[PDB]
Design a protein around this nucleic acid. Sequence first.
DNA 1: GGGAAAATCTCTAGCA
DNA 2: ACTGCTAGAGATTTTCCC
DNA 3: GGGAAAATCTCTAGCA
DNA 4: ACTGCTAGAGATTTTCCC
Lengths: 244, 244, 231, 231, 63, 63, 47, 47
Amino acid sequence: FLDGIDKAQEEHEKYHSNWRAMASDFNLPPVVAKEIVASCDKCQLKGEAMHGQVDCSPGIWQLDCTHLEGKVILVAVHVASGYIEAEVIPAETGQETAYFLLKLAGRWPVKTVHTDNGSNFTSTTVKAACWWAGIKQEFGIPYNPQSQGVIESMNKELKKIIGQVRDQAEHLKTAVQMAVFIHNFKRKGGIGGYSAGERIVDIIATDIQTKELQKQITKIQNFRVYKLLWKGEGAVVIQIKVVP
Amino acid sequence: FLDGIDKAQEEHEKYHSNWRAMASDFNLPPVVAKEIVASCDKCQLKGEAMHGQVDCSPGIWQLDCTHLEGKVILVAVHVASGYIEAEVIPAETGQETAYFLLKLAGRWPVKTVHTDNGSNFTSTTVKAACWWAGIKQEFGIPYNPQSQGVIESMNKELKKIIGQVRDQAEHLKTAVQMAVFIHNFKRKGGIGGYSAGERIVDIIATDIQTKELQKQITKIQNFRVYKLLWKGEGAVVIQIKVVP
Amino acid sequence: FLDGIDKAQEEHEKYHSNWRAMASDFNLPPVVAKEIVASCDKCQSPGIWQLDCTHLEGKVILVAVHVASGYIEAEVIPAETGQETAYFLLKLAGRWPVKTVHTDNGSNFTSTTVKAACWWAGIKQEFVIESMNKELKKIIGQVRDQAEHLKTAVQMAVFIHNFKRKGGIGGYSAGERIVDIIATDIQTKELQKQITKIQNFRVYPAKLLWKGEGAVVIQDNSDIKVVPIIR
Amino acid sequence: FLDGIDKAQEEHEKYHSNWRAMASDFNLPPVVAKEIVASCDKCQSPGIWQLDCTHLEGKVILVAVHVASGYIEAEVIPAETGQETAYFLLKLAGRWPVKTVHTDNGSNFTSTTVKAACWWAGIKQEFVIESMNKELKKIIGQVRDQAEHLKTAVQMAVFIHNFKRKGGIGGYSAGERIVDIIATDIQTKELQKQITKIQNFRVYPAKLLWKGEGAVVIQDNSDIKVVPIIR
Amino acid sequence: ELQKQITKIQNFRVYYRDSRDPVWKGPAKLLWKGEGAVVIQDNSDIKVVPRRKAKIIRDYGKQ
Amino acid sequence: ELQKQITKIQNFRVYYRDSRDPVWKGPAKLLWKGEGAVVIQDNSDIKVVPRRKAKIIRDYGKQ
Amino acid sequence: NFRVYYRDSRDPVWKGPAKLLWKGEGAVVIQDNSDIKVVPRRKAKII
Amino acid sequence: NFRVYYRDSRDPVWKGPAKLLWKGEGAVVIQDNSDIKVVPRRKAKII
DNA sequence: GGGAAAATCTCTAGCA
DNA sequence: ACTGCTAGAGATTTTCCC
DNA sequence: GGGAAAATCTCTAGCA
DNA sequence: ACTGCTAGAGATTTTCCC
Ligand SMILES: [Ca+2]
Ligand SMILES: [Ca+2]
Ligand SMILES: [Ca+2]
Ligand SMILES: [Ca+2]
Ligand SMILES: [Zn+2]
Ligand SMILES: [Zn+2]
Ligand SMILES: [Zn+2]
Ligand SMILES: [Zn+2]
């Protein structure tokens, strides 16, 4: 039916009909009409209907600046627990960002920060602070704010809590720190029924305890399975495959 | 545990903690903590996680103005079939809207139009045209554009098709009518594997044929079931209940 | 299944009903009934519109009539220009399945712009519609005092003609007639697509009329058989 | 299940281990092991911080020390003002579970703003931390040439103290010590919430220690029994 | 003279929806068509859909 | 002296995710923890999750 | 008798409580201080 | 060998085709006329 | 084995 | 060579309580 | 009863 | 007393073909 291919291409060059229209009008199988619409450069206008998944390691944080009442709030989240650090900074500058990040890295075990491509985070000042503190800098894809979705969800939740307790504070600094208190310790629910403050110390104490426990386990089990990771009665995990 | 209720209300007045935090901190059952958070006016900040459903009757259309290249495109959709009427109007005025609507009602059996609260559609001019043509005017909830979701989806699809064939036309009027041609007749898929032009005549011919057929059926079956609508061997539908 | 086939073959050779009557009466698939009506030797237009220009009050109204139904579309155009005619024709082809337009060989109908619009939309040009023009002009005179402009009176007249003037055999309006005619044409096109899809198959050497879920209807030497396939 | 209970009771009356050792050694729920350690008569602070002000280079550094772990938080504040002290205290209470602060009764620590901040955050005020202040001041002197400002040197010193100075028994830093201490306090609070939730139930008249999916552990007259409940 | 018309009205397909499920449920069998409601038979289950929630077509892939 | 530590590392719960399913699958049993991968046992099924796709906690509602 | 806390015309703040007059499939008609309003059900919470 | 038609920095138009260099879980690294770009997989189509 | 409570599932706004 | 998520509201399903 | 094709399901942008 | 949807891309499930 190559006459159908020729007339279907000659009609798709005008009307840009999809594969169902060319498969119904010119007696084409769906593979051939899909090839005709896929060979057109003007018809590739839609991406994959999926979503990625952010890095929820126990050492990676996510930072973002938001704006409220004409002031700048620099917010960081522990993406494995939802623990929120936040400050009101006098300017959206790399100096204040590097100060906030050095103070946060001194407070908590920060291994990685995942920011956008804001000038605050892209600067040489935040780049020397993360070199000194030992923090790795991951930057998201530009104008893709979903790559830092944890910190934008926490910006939404933090602005909601700030709006709830705004009349209890006379300045915005007090309201931001009150909202940080309320989110970290006065709101529960999640992967353990915890607040974010309980969840971050569970994440970090679990990281320390499992690291030391696996270090003590690994120096005893020294079998070579045809390196033994975990022996069970139904399967055996080696390195990483699960042999029956 | 009314001491728990008193301290939980006294703490929720400060921190606005959710029901899980008050149920974990003050030994409350989930019903009582849910009552404490539901009696607070400051904590009702989220609506129902659902969506409504538009009226897909065979006689209702949906109209909207969009803007492209500095010009105004008045678009109407048959929401039961996706059939698109569109024009480039010289101004977003009720005179041009009433002309487009009177012309559309003369072309197709328009029983209802569902517009937003744009001044074009809210005017006295479009109100005399729909009175003369016999069209009912439904207006959506203001600043809720999802109540006219069919016409906004068709505005997105129409702008995509206009962008595909923009270099085949020297004016935007020709490109809009070419896109109307392509959407109504050169793109298939949907509830019958049809294009929108086949689907609207299926919808309307089915409406006419089923109306005449039920009119001829109803004047014969005149039984009173303890009014008969449809008798089967397993059930009987009366009026409207399905009696076994 | 063969019982309805032999009843339809005898009923066609005694009465000569078409494939729609034999598909409604004897519960056959339409490919089988069309092969029954095509086996006989005694029994060996919904896309044609017609365009004219009518002058009222100095203004010009372009009028397209569906010649099978009498459905009408009129527009007060600013001039008898090939641009305006091609714009009207591209609008009409986008609204309805227009395959052929019949014009009156004017300076605007034989323009290169209308030829380009008919080439793009796929319309063929050919060079009692005056009854439709007279009924439209008398409805305009009946409705002119209800409008301020002439452009919003021809649309009122098109509404009155297409949906408020019933007549003919069954008392249907022009809108019901055109949707029944276009639905019949879509059924005809779907049956032709179903015939063309199986016209290359051969069943062992016989044709393939209908491949059911348990039966296969073949035609070996003008004899429709039902047996329970190479391309 | 009763076997581990009698082994834990004998092991507690011969060795006097706490409920964590009896819950890890004999696979008991912690309510049962805590009732074992509470039945005995021989065996009848993670939220306390301490705040001081240290003057370096004319500027004032407010220093909070977790007195159970030695974890430190320092901020160069613009003045010894109750506003700045209450802001530091609300920040610290939002970061960590602060229950008690111990101050040095200054004009800024006994202010009404700090009292309002401690009332809002729920902190109680009380009126070898100088060892922590001396170690912080010597780390600042060790790190002052790596910073341009003093405010970004005290954060470097807080980083070095909390995560780069290990010592004590197990060689842990102050950050690992404070997360282990706060995790132990959270386990203590969850066990107290589990005890308070079942302290009103009575089983037929005996206490309710653990309601399993097939067993119910009661205590009738200092005798932990396992039988397979009114409030 | 009547059962022919009843089977003819049963040859129509209905695509309907429920109150909170946003997906279009598949082609049912039209049993009865009214001014405000439509009685269908989907999966040997007789339902009464509102008229505003139903798209009724005679699928011209009946060939 | 070793099986005590193995059961202790098996007392930890893992909340993991797959490559294209955005929902958080429930608390699995931690069998092994590495630098880049984490071997879990969910529903008697031994999986190897990446380390970046797992939240490991000792649930302190173990009381 | 119900309380309705709703979201209004291009305003991020949530108003209420209001008397519920009518509850539909996707919208509610309520009365907030002698003002009959029609709100979507995604922009309203009924208690 | 793949063709990648992608969506770029705040531009509604779709560019391409480009050589696919690396395909990840949620992003792709491609090369459109000697320009190494990292696009999300929702903003790219691979053929 | 019904009823109630709790756990889980589904879905949406809003942050970019 | 990197990546939507989070918390709340309501519906549905599973588990506990005799 | 495997493999391929078709039908169905899942999910997302973008229009407001 | 009113109301998200639509079309495309990819994965998964069902149906056809001997
Ligand atoms: Ca940003
Ligand atoms: Ca509008
Ligand atoms: Ca942001
Ligand atoms: Ca719009
Ligand atoms: Zn194309
Ligand atoms: Zn509240
Ligand atoms: Zn014949
Ligand atoms: Zn003791």
